[PDB]
Amino acid sequence: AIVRAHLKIYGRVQGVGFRWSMQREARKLGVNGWVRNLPDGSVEAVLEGDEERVEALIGWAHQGPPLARVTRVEVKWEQPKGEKGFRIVA
Amino acid sequence: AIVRAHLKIYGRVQGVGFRWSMQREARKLGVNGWVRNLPDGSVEAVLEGDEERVEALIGWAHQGPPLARVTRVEVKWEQPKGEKGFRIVA
Ligand SMILES: [K+]
Ligand SMILES: [K+]
Ligand SMILES: [K+]
């Protein structure tokens, strides 16, 4: 079943290649959506695809690239909008 | 590789069969550890095993059983201790 998850990731998550890494991981898992850094220092992302794939990426996001230290993730499930491909946005 | 994750799950997470469901899901993925309800209304869990499997379970934990509404998950990575099997504790 196709699901859509809206994430907010906190901790030491910027300046560690998080966006690039999530995109890489997303493509490998086949997840669509986007990711971006917010001015408050957190990371925001939209994941859309098969629940198994999205959940796998959510789990990975709690680890992130080597230098990342995620202390918390807030998820909001929503209705899919037809996202295609995973991109790094502003 | 083997990893250990300490979780704190918040939201509408108790009285929805979360513990039973996480145990079921854990056995299916082959994750070791435990889960339990805390008096402050949150859920606490320890997941240990191959990172791919643990991450999969963490992702699932953001969805949880049908009635569950997870608003936040706090993860803390630690050194594995040799957990074996997944159980529901007090
Ligand atoms: K940061
Ligand atoms: K990390
Ligand atoms: K649910």
Author numbering:
A (entry chain A), B (entry chain B): 2 to 91
Published text:
Here we used a pair of thermophilic/mesophilic acylphosphatases homologues (acylphosphatase from hyperthermophilic archaeon Pyrococcus horikoshii (PhAcP) and human common-type acylphosphatase (HuAcP)) as a model to study how local flexibility of the active site affects the enzymatic activity. The salt-bridge between the active-site residue Arg-20 and the C-terminal carboxyl group is found only in thermophilic PhAcP but not in mesophilic HuAcP. Taken together, our data suggest that the presence of the salt-bridge between the C-terminal carboxyl group and the active-site arginine residue increases the activation energy that results in a stronger temperature dependency of the enzymatic activity.
To investigate how this salt-bridge affects the enzymatic activity, we need to engineer a variant of PhAcP in which the salt-bridge was disrupted without perturbing the active site. Molecular modeling suggested that the formation of the salt-bridge required the C-terminal residue Gly-91 to adopt an unusual phi angle of ∼180°. Thus, any non-glycine substitutions could disrupt the interaction. We then replaced the Gly-91 by an alanine residue to yield a variant of PhAcP (PhG91A) by site-directed mutagenesis. The substitution did not significantly affect the stability of the enzymes, for the apparent melting temperatures of PhWT (∼107°C) and PhG91A (∼106°C) were similar and there was no significant difference between the values of free energy of unfolding (ΔGu) for PhWT (58±7 kJ mol−1) and PhG91 (51±6 kJ mol−1). PhWT and PhG91A both gave straight lines that intersected at ∼298 K. PhWT had a steeper slope denoting a stronger temperature dependency of the enzymatic activity than PhG91A. In terms of the activation energy (Ea) of the reactions calculated from the slope of the Arrhenius plot, PhWT displayed a greater Ea value (49.1±1.4 kJmol−1) than PhG91A (32.1±1.7 kJmol−1). In contrast, despite the mtm180° rotamer conformation, transitions to ptt180°, ttp180°, and mtt180° rotamers were prominent in the MD trajectories of PhG91A and HuA99.
